[PDB]
């Protein structure tokens, strides 16, 4: 139910127009060819508004276009071309509802990756940074107007921005084994992209034995799944989980009966058997299926906090390309990615994301009178009325409800733990108590600014809203069409250098610490220990500071829910 | 002889690593137990890249481990066992020089067979296919990283792959009857395994009354030998000879004196005496015997084109287990196997195999000045300088030297005929003049691809070479670690379907034709009849066509050497 001011839409439209002109003025007459395993690609040198330069390769295919017969199926190897492929322009994004215009946009032909570097023949093979975009497995792209590499190319890395399939086209799951639609096609897209990166990044000056995958939100859950699944074993070497992981409630779902339901909304007209539902969905118009996803969830599922109709899932039977054979919790216990350096973190006010949704639908704070809807499904009964479940809601009410009446602030603070802090805590402990995993570095993004923004602020109508929301940190990692040239001495600019500098440092060494990052002199950044009772993290504000996590107290309160059921923690 | 580059060896090494984890990814949690006359055996359900499943039993002993006193001796019945024997992994290959790493690997403990089928409980008693691997009788195995059943298990058949003893450990031959080392130990393993199969294939859903033995190259000569020996009279019902047969000149050898020569290279010591030479080789380290067998052949012998020092031999005295009491061509006249449906074939450029050898040894092409060294030993004088043999060599030369000076390509053309096509001619004709044996169906594999390969291409440094070498057809019968999933529409996948379908068709009925097979509409595939002056063959490339053998003209030029010796032909 995300709505955007009609003026903001006009203002966004004029920005799209203006961004086309800027993009041209930063394009150079310098093109260049790189080799790949499937053939030659042609890129272009581009400039930044800071007058840095980099080589851009966009729309490199890592898989066959998943159309016709390939709809809902695992991606297959792309086919080699002779000659030279023009990669001087972006290709289209995955079919999705545009988060601003509310229109359906994109294309089924979306399996592409983009490669950026400041030097195509460096004296050393560079760290490779792979970004998986977020958007709830329902939106997002690798377009430079949302995820410009302009900041990262100040640093000596190869940066790669991937696409993957989204929504029902990415994540439709059917139980029938005859059909070859187990689910997670968009996740298997990512695996194949990652595989391409390992086999080809050297051709762009990157070190295949030094690959970092990071992502934010659904991109972080994606990164984690890429660290869990046996498909990607040993393929990368560092992982960064930005505001998300694979055991977040929103990060997965058993969507196997939602396909008959999607077919129905599209004009089916047949029986609830997987075979005929797939037959019909295989003829449906892509844009129409995507249009109707928002109505697939029943009020009961929405009330039980199911976020999306289609997403990552436990696959109902084994296949060769199976990415998620068991529950994420179970896969953690056996995860190869436990063995690699890991950095995690969240913004300092994640739930602030829901500010204008609560304005649209104010009858939501009443869900805090009893916090029954936010009790983890493991503990909550079917009807969610049993005294054990009320007793536990009460534990959450105590942690978040500030007065005698629950408010907007309480709800948004509760969401920060429900969607982010608590799952990350659980992952940290489960990681210690069932695996020998390499300790994790924690950060906390707490830098607020209204002077430089990204387009997610528009989507949630968060302009002028003070506080550091889910999504706010991407502004200091990526150029976007709403960004601007900042004075070299300003607050926002130094955060860019810090964030990009810390991620680069972590991608290089496995340790985010550097004394060459201004503000980070005198910082003692320790990884989290099994023994630790309170986590310590680098709080990223105007100054960099090692505080212990302020959310700890409340995280401990959420943990008490599991007092009697200590094995499900 | 065959050398592999460091670059290719490194790539092979990492391919082995990757294959191991792909093997785990392709492994189900489904195990099954089957009966044997020796005890119960545990197997596993395994997936395929195309997402087919099959039940896999590896490491079923059909004989006693030929160690200690059993070395060089005929194989002995295995010992029965109580409970469930585990057959979820491959056993060792026969002691061997690795055809890529150049290092000795494998073990004396190698008398095992594997059994694969998509169904333990089929509706019919299925055709049983029994593949005998090639490798000149010195290399080879039944591991699925070289001979993967993944393609055949698409068909409703039982597929079985045997191991047998290689090199000196399987083919030592000594004249003295007291010592009981007559020769053909490895072929005796083959008899043993076949008997196990007759007696046990019904336990896996096979038809004891419908068994096909097929082998490529030395496995083809092995297959022929099994069709020739009284030891196996009755056991099986079809035979397919792929690039070779028992009257090929590399396919047998009188190796009796060479046990001394090997024993000498290894340290011995005493006199040219079958008793003492044997005592030494018995105490000797198996890996030392195999490493040195490369040095056993004199210059004399390999000039005369003796290719292997140890191999199938005419046994000097009769034993209960004797496989070969006479010369192969005399055994053809008596062979039980002449009455069973037979398929024979060759590739369209078998000699292209020696390509790297000629690059390594350009001096080799000088043997084509006279061609004296390629003259059938039947026809040639000892030192190969007599007027009559210069004239016979002159007839070989006219057939193959295209220009005026002999090139590498004339050498390879010649090799196609000397090793394969001519012996095949001679076999068909021998079966006509001296037997009322069955009309043989002939095929020609003529499909070239660089998109899908097998390890032998690595071995023969054939990565870049255009044309269809000896060994190239196996890529379309067996999965291997260098293989990948192909698209259903691709020219390679379609070949796999055809090859596998034709083999399965011929295994079922004894006629290789079916209109079920995609490229086999409008093909009248008749077998070769006594009256045919020009052979007719199914040619397999992108299309499937009945033609006359393109090599027929040169075959008849080879035959003209016997003009004055019609009796020896």
PDB file of C-alpha atoms in Angstrom, chain A residues 86-290:
ATOM      1  CA  UNK A  86      27.712  -3.802 -27.168  1.00  0.00           C
ATOM      2  CA  UNK A  87      27.470  -3.248 -23.409  1.00  0.00           C
ATOM      3  CA  UNK A  88      27.519   0.598 -23.460  1.00  0.00           C
ATOM      4  CA  UNK A  89      23.870   0.790 -22.364  1.00  0.00           C
ATOM      5  CA  UNK A  90      21.861  -0.842 -19.567  1.00  0.00           C
ATOM      6  CA  UNK A  91      19.313  -3.502 -20.369  1.00  0.00           C
ATOM      7  CA  UNK A  92      15.813  -3.669 -18.859  1.00  0.00           C
ATOM      8  CA  UNK A  93      14.954  -4.607 -15.267  1.00  0.00           C
ATOM      9  CA  UNK A  94      12.902  -7.557 -14.018  1.00  0.00           C
ATOM     10  CA  UNK A  95       9.104  -7.305 -14.352  1.00  0.00           C
ATOM     11  CA  UNK A  96       7.881  -5.402 -11.324  1.00  0.00           C
ATOM     12  CA  UNK A  97       5.616  -2.617 -10.181  1.00  0.00           C
ATOM     13  CA  UNK A  98       7.503   0.701 -10.227  1.00  0.00           C
ATOM     14  CA  UNK A  99       7.827   1.791  -6.619  1.00  0.00           C
ATOM     15  CA  UNK A 100       7.143   5.447  -7.521  1.00  0.00           C
ATOM     16  CA  UNK A 101       4.812   5.559 -10.549  1.00  0.00           C
ATOM     17  CA  UNK A 102       2.871   2.441  -9.476  1.00  0.00           C
ATOM     18  CA  UNK A 103       2.955   1.268 -13.095  1.00  0.00           C
ATOM     19  CA  UNK A 104       4.225  -2.117 -14.284  1.00  0.00           C
ATOM     20  CA  UNK A 105       7.698  -1.842 -15.831  1.00  0.00           C
ATOM     21  CA  UNK A 106      10.578  -4.010 -16.965  1.00  0.00           C
ATOM     22  CA  UNK A 107      10.922  -7.169 -18.987  1.00  0.00           C
ATOM     23  CA  UNK A 108      11.258 -10.953 -18.671  1.00  0.00           C
ATOM     24  CA  UNK A 109      14.599 -10.601 -20.453  1.00  0.00           C
ATOM     25  CA  UNK A 110      16.448  -9.414 -17.340  1.00  0.00           C
ATOM     26  CA  UNK A 111      19.297 -11.810 -16.495  1.00  0.00           C
ATOM     27  CA  UNK A 112      22.176  -9.358 -16.718  1.00  0.00           C
ATOM     28  CA  UNK A 113      25.156  -8.214 -14.712  1.00  0.00           C
ATOM     29  CA  UNK A 114      27.081  -4.910 -14.826  1.00  0.00           C
ATOM     30  CA  UNK A 115      30.868  -4.498 -14.274  1.00  0.00           C
ATOM     31  CA  UNK A 116      32.665  -1.287 -13.170  1.00  0.00           C
ATOM     32  CA  UNK A 117      36.387  -0.493 -12.633  1.00  0.00           C
ATOM     33  CA  UNK A 118      38.672   2.600 -12.713  1.00  0.00           C
ATOM     34  CA  UNK A 119      41.433   0.639 -14.439  1.00  0.00           C
ATOM     35  CA  UNK A 120      40.915  -2.282 -16.797  1.00  0.00           C
ATOM     36  CA  UNK A 121      44.527  -3.461 -16.485  1.00  0.00           C
ATOM     37  CA  UNK A 122      45.691  -2.808 -12.914  1.00  0.00           C
ATOM     38  CA  UNK A 123      49.154  -3.743 -11.579  1.00  0.00           C
ATOM     39  CA  UNK A 124      47.455  -6.135  -9.119  1.00  0.00           C
ATOM     40  CA  UNK A 125      44.282  -8.250  -9.298  1.00  0.00           C
ATOM     41  CA  UNK A 126      41.727  -6.278  -7.310  1.00  0.00           C
ATOM     42  CA  UNK A 127      39.120  -7.118  -4.676  1.00  0.00           C
ATOM     43  CA  UNK A 128      35.778  -7.959  -6.354  1.00  0.00           C
ATOM     44  CA  UNK A 129      32.656  -6.525  -4.748  1.00  0.00           C
ATOM     45  CA  UNK A 130      29.326  -8.055  -5.812  1.00  0.00           C
ATOM     46  CA  UNK A 131      26.164  -6.178  -4.954  1.00  0.00           C
ATOM     47  CA  UNK A 132      22.800  -7.901  -4.716  1.00  0.00           C
ATOM     48  CA  UNK A 133      20.046  -5.363  -4.638  1.00  0.00           C
ATOM     49  CA  UNK A 134      17.135  -5.408  -2.239  1.00  0.00           C
ATOM     50  CA  UNK A 135      13.480  -4.634  -2.868  1.00  0.00           C
ATOM     51  CA  UNK A 136      11.717  -7.541  -1.132  1.00  0.00           C
ATOM     52  CA  UNK A 137      12.375  -9.962  -4.024  1.00  0.00           C
ATOM     53  CA  UNK A 138       9.678  -7.882  -5.783  1.00  0.00           C
ATOM     54  CA  UNK A 139      11.452  -4.675  -6.930  1.00  0.00           C
ATOM     55  CA  UNK A 140      14.892  -3.294  -7.795  1.00  0.00           C
ATOM     56  CA  UNK A 141      17.527  -3.318 -10.526  1.00  0.00           C
ATOM     57  CA  UNK A 142      21.167  -2.623 -11.358  1.00  0.00           C
ATOM     58  CA  UNK A 143      20.529   0.631 -13.265  1.00  0.00           C
ATOM     59  CA  UNK A 144      23.138   3.349 -12.612  1.00  0.00           C
ATOM     60  CA  UNK A 145      20.443   5.893 -11.788  1.00  0.00           C
ATOM     61  CA  UNK A 146      19.696   3.835  -8.627  1.00  0.00           C
ATOM     62  CA  UNK A 147      23.040   2.090  -8.052  1.00  0.00           C
ATOM     63  CA  UNK A 148      25.744   4.231  -9.629  1.00  0.00           C
ATOM     64  CA  UNK A 149      29.299   2.961  -9.004  1.00  0.00           C
ATOM     65  CA  UNK A 150      30.623   6.535  -8.874  1.00  0.00           C
ATOM     66  CA  UNK A 151      31.855   6.390  -5.249  1.00  0.00           C
ATOM     67  CA  UNK A 152      33.278   2.869  -5.332  1.00  0.00           C
ATOM     68  CA  UNK A 153      35.392   3.619  -8.412  1.00  0.00           C
ATOM     69  CA  UNK A 154      37.428   6.110  -6.322  1.00  0.00           C
ATOM     70  CA  UNK A 155      38.763   2.858  -4.836  1.00  0.00           C
ATOM     71  CA  UNK A 156      40.818   0.130  -6.545  1.00  0.00           C
ATOM     72  CA  UNK A 157      38.162  -2.565  -6.738  1.00  0.00           C
ATOM     73  CA  UNK A 158      36.019  -4.219  -9.361  1.00  0.00           C
ATOM     74  CA  UNK A 159      32.382  -3.586  -8.547  1.00  0.00           C
ATOM     75  CA  UNK A 160      29.697  -5.830 -10.043  1.00  0.00           C
ATOM     76  CA  UNK A 161      25.939  -5.135  -9.795  1.00  0.00           C
ATOM     77  CA  UNK A 162      23.675  -8.113 -10.575  1.00  0.00           C
ATOM     78  CA  UNK A 163      20.074  -8.544 -11.557  1.00  0.00           C
ATOM     79  CA  UNK A 164      17.904 -11.636 -10.837  1.00  0.00           C
ATOM     80  CA  UNK A 165      14.198 -12.545 -11.386  1.00  0.00           C
ATOM     81  CA  UNK A 166      11.587 -10.973  -9.094  1.00  0.00           C
ATOM     82  CA  UNK A 167       8.054 -11.695  -7.854  1.00  0.00           C
ATOM     83  CA  UNK A 168       6.124 -14.752  -9.115  1.00  0.00           C
ATOM     84  CA  UNK A 169       8.415 -14.976 -12.153  1.00  0.00           C
ATOM     85  CA  UNK A 170      11.345 -15.286  -9.766  1.00  0.00           C
ATOM     86  CA  UNK A 171       9.851 -17.370  -6.969  1.00  0.00           C
ATOM     87  CA  UNK A 172       6.773 -19.410  -8.015  1.00  0.00           C
ATOM     88  CA  UNK A 173       6.809 -22.820  -6.333  1.00  0.00           C
ATOM     89  CA  UNK A 174       4.763 -25.925  -7.161  1.00  0.00           C
ATOM     90  CA  UNK A 175       4.753 -29.222  -5.262  1.00  0.00           C
ATOM     91  CA  UNK A 176       4.476 -31.516  -8.301  1.00  0.00           C
ATOM     92  CA  UNK A 177       7.917 -32.984  -9.116  1.00  0.00           C
ATOM     93  CA  UNK A 178       6.935 -33.678 -12.748  1.00  0.00           C
ATOM     94  CA  UNK A 179       6.754 -29.944 -13.408  1.00  0.00           C
ATOM     95  CA  UNK A 180      10.314 -28.762 -12.616  1.00  0.00           C
ATOM     96  CA  UNK A 181       9.091 -25.621 -10.817  1.00  0.00           C
ATOM     97  CA  UNK A 182      10.515 -26.201  -7.296  1.00  0.00           C
ATOM     98  CA  UNK A 183      10.828 -22.441  -6.594  1.00  0.00           C
ATOM     99  CA  UNK A 184      13.747 -20.049  -6.027  1.00  0.00           C
ATOM    100  CA  UNK A 185      14.519 -19.414  -9.727  1.00  0.00           C
ATOM    101  CA  UNK A 186      15.679 -15.864  -8.851  1.00  0.00           C
ATOM    102  CA  UNK A 187      18.015 -17.345  -6.239  1.00  0.00           C
ATOM    103  CA  UNK A 188      19.379 -19.746  -8.837  1.00  0.00           C
ATOM    104  CA  UNK A 189      19.829 -16.682 -11.072  1.00  0.00           C
ATOM    105  CA  UNK A 190      22.110 -15.236  -8.365  1.00  0.00           C
ATOM    106  CA  UNK A 191      24.073 -18.534  -8.122  1.00  0.00           C
ATOM    107  CA  UNK A 192      24.640 -18.475 -11.861  1.00  0.00           C
ATOM    108  CA  UNK A 193      25.616 -14.777 -11.786  1.00  0.00           C
ATOM    109  CA  UNK A 194      28.062 -15.543  -8.943  1.00  0.00           C
ATOM    110  CA  UNK A 195      29.422 -18.437 -11.028  1.00  0.00           C
ATOM    111  CA  UNK A 196      29.953 -16.153 -14.019  1.00  0.00           C
ATOM    112  CA  UNK A 197      31.767 -13.689 -11.753  1.00  0.00           C
ATOM    113  CA  UNK A 198      34.193 -16.313 -10.491  1.00  0.00           C
ATOM    114  CA  UNK A 199      34.992 -17.434 -14.060  1.00  0.00           C
ATOM    115  CA  UNK A 200      35.229 -13.943 -15.647  1.00  0.00           C
ATOM    116  CA  UNK A 201      36.179 -11.228 -13.123  1.00  0.00           C
ATOM    117  CA  UNK A 202      39.929 -11.640 -13.919  1.00  0.00           C
ATOM    118  CA  UNK A 203      39.182 -10.408 -17.441  1.00  0.00           C
ATOM    119  CA  UNK A 204      38.293  -7.105 -15.785  1.00  0.00           C
ATOM    120  CA  UNK A 205      41.295  -7.058 -13.453  1.00  0.00           C
ATOM    121  CA  UNK A 206      39.572  -8.735 -10.493  1.00  0.00           C
ATOM    122  CA  UNK A 207      40.951 -11.397  -8.139  1.00  0.00           C
ATOM    123  CA  UNK A 208      38.724 -14.547  -8.252  1.00  0.00           C
ATOM    124  CA  UNK A 209      40.231 -15.671  -4.922  1.00  0.00           C
ATOM    125  CA  UNK A 210      39.095 -12.405  -3.328  1.00  0.00           C
ATOM    126  CA  UNK A 211      35.358 -11.972  -3.870  1.00  0.00           C
ATOM    127  CA  UNK A 212      33.011 -10.180  -1.511  1.00  0.00           C
ATOM    128  CA  UNK A 213      29.241 -10.398  -1.791  1.00  0.00           C
ATOM    129  CA  UNK A 214      27.191  -7.796  -0.061  1.00  0.00           C
ATOM    130  CA  UNK A 215      23.636  -6.610  -0.307  1.00  0.00           C
ATOM    131  CA  UNK A 216      21.017  -4.715   1.596  1.00  0.00           C
ATOM    132  CA  UNK A 217      17.674  -5.974   2.925  1.00  0.00           C
ATOM    133  CA  UNK A 218      16.407  -8.650   0.537  1.00  0.00           C
ATOM    134  CA  UNK A 219      19.874  -8.238  -0.986  1.00  0.00           C
ATOM    135  CA  UNK A 220      21.380  -9.116   2.414  1.00  0.00           C
ATOM    136  CA  UNK A 221      19.018 -12.143   2.790  1.00  0.00           C
ATOM    137  CA  UNK A 222      20.097 -13.060  -0.726  1.00  0.00           C
ATOM    138  CA  UNK A 223      23.786 -12.718   0.273  1.00  0.00           C
ATOM    139  CA  UNK A 224      23.158 -14.991   3.247  1.00  0.00           C
ATOM    140  CA  UNK A 225      21.359 -17.605   1.150  1.00  0.00           C
ATOM    141  CA  UNK A 226      24.394 -17.399  -1.152  1.00  0.00           C
ATOM    142  CA  UNK A 227      26.512 -18.182   1.935  1.00  0.00           C
ATOM    143  CA  UNK A 228      24.194 -21.004   3.050  1.00  0.00           C
ATOM    144  CA  UNK A 229      23.546 -23.010  -0.108  1.00  0.00           C
ATOM    145  CA  UNK A 230      25.917 -25.797  -1.184  1.00  0.00           C
ATOM    146  CA  UNK A 231      25.592 -24.547  -4.792  1.00  0.00           C
ATOM    147  CA  UNK A 232      27.889 -21.577  -4.074  1.00  0.00           C
ATOM    148  CA  UNK A 233      30.467 -23.429  -1.942  1.00  0.00           C
ATOM    149  CA  UNK A 234      33.889 -21.667  -1.810  1.00  0.00           C
ATOM    150  CA  UNK A 235      32.830 -19.258  -4.572  1.00  0.00           C
ATOM    151  CA  UNK A 236      33.355 -16.102  -2.514  1.00  0.00           C
ATOM    152  CA  UNK A 237      35.437 -14.982   0.480  1.00  0.00           C
ATOM    153  CA  UNK A 238      33.713 -12.201   2.435  1.00  0.00           C
ATOM    154  CA  UNK A 239      30.037 -11.536   3.118  1.00  0.00           C
ATOM    155  CA  UNK A 240      28.315  -8.348   4.291  1.00  0.00           C
ATOM    156  CA  UNK A 241      24.759  -8.504   5.540  1.00  0.00           C
ATOM    157  CA  UNK A 242      23.184  -5.045   5.463  1.00  0.00           C
ATOM    158  CA  UNK A 243      19.888  -4.852   7.365  1.00  0.00           C
ATOM    159  CA  UNK A 244      18.909  -8.457   6.756  1.00  0.00           C
ATOM    160  CA  UNK A 245      19.667 -12.146   6.764  1.00  0.00           C
ATOM    161  CA  UNK A 246      18.033 -15.460   5.824  1.00  0.00           C
ATOM    162  CA  UNK A 247      16.126 -16.087   9.082  1.00  0.00           C
ATOM    163  CA  UNK A 248      14.331 -12.758   8.992  1.00  0.00           C
ATOM    164  CA  UNK A 249      10.550 -13.422   8.907  1.00  0.00           C
ATOM    165  CA  UNK A 250      10.072 -11.587   5.585  1.00  0.00           C
ATOM    166  CA  UNK A 251      12.954 -13.394   3.896  1.00  0.00           C
ATOM    167  CA  UNK A 252      11.101 -16.659   3.103  1.00  0.00           C
ATOM    168  CA  UNK A 253       7.710 -18.350   2.836  1.00  0.00           C
ATOM    169  CA  UNK A 254       5.943 -21.580   1.830  1.00  0.00           C
ATOM    170  CA  UNK A 255       4.200 -20.227  -1.284  1.00  0.00           C
ATOM    171  CA  UNK A 256       3.134 -23.549  -2.837  1.00  0.00           C
ATOM    172  CA  UNK A 257      -0.636 -22.875  -2.758  1.00  0.00           C
ATOM    173  CA  UNK A 258      -0.327 -19.224  -3.768  1.00  0.00           C
ATOM    174  CA  UNK A 259       0.093 -20.102  -7.492  1.00  0.00           C
ATOM    175  CA  UNK A 260      -3.476 -21.430  -7.943  1.00  0.00           C
ATOM    176  CA  UNK A 261      -4.490 -18.181  -6.217  1.00  0.00           C
ATOM    177  CA  UNK A 262      -2.490 -15.999  -8.626  1.00  0.00           C
ATOM    178  CA  UNK A 263      -3.875 -17.911 -11.610  1.00  0.00           C
ATOM    179  CA  UNK A 264      -7.407 -17.260 -10.295  1.00  0.00           C
ATOM    180  CA  UNK A 265      -6.908 -13.471 -10.045  1.00  0.00           C
ATOM    181  CA  UNK A 266      -5.658 -13.559 -13.646  1.00  0.00           C
ATOM    182  CA  UNK A 267      -8.802 -15.331 -14.959  1.00  0.00           C
ATOM    183  CA  UNK A 268      -8.421 -19.038 -14.130  1.00  0.00           C
ATOM    184  CA  UNK A 269     -10.835 -20.921 -14.624  1.00  0.00           C
ATOM    185  CA  UNK A 270      -9.694 -24.493 -13.934  1.00  0.00           C
ATOM    186  CA  UNK A 271      -8.928 -26.916 -11.101  1.00  0.00           C
ATOM    187  CA  UNK A 272      -6.427 -26.681  -8.210  1.00  0.00           C
ATOM    188  CA  UNK A 273      -3.866 -29.013  -9.718  1.00  0.00           C
ATOM    189  CA  UNK A 274      -0.295 -27.879 -10.291  1.00  0.00           C
ATOM    190  CA  UNK A 275      -0.212 -29.066 -13.939  1.00  0.00           C
ATOM    191  CA  UNK A 276      -3.108 -26.950 -15.257  1.00  0.00           C
ATOM    192  CA  UNK A 277      -2.292 -23.951 -13.049  1.00  0.00           C
ATOM    193  CA  UNK A 278       1.223 -23.924 -14.607  1.00  0.00           C
ATOM    194  CA  UNK A 279      -0.152 -24.431 -18.125  1.00  0.00           C
ATOM    195  CA  UNK A 280      -2.246 -21.292 -17.637  1.00  0.00           C
ATOM    196  CA  UNK A 281       0.454 -19.225 -15.896  1.00  0.00           C
ATOM    197  CA  UNK A 282       2.837 -20.165 -18.723  1.00  0.00           C
ATOM    198  CA  UNK A 283       0.514 -18.353 -21.164  1.00  0.00           C
ATOM    199  CA  UNK A 284      -0.284 -15.403 -18.920  1.00  0.00           C
ATOM    200  CA  UNK A 285       1.013 -11.942 -19.795  1.00  0.00           C
ATOM    201  CA  UNK A 286       4.055 -11.167 -17.571  1.00  0.00           C
ATOM    202  CA  UNK A 287       2.909  -7.641 -16.604  1.00  0.00           C
ATOM    203  CA  UNK A 288      -0.546  -8.924 -15.615  1.00  0.00           C
ATOM    204  CA  UNK A 289       0.766 -11.577 -13.217  1.00  0.00           C
ATOM    205  CA  UNK A 290       2.972  -8.902 -11.614  1.00  0.00           C
TER     206      UNK A 290
END
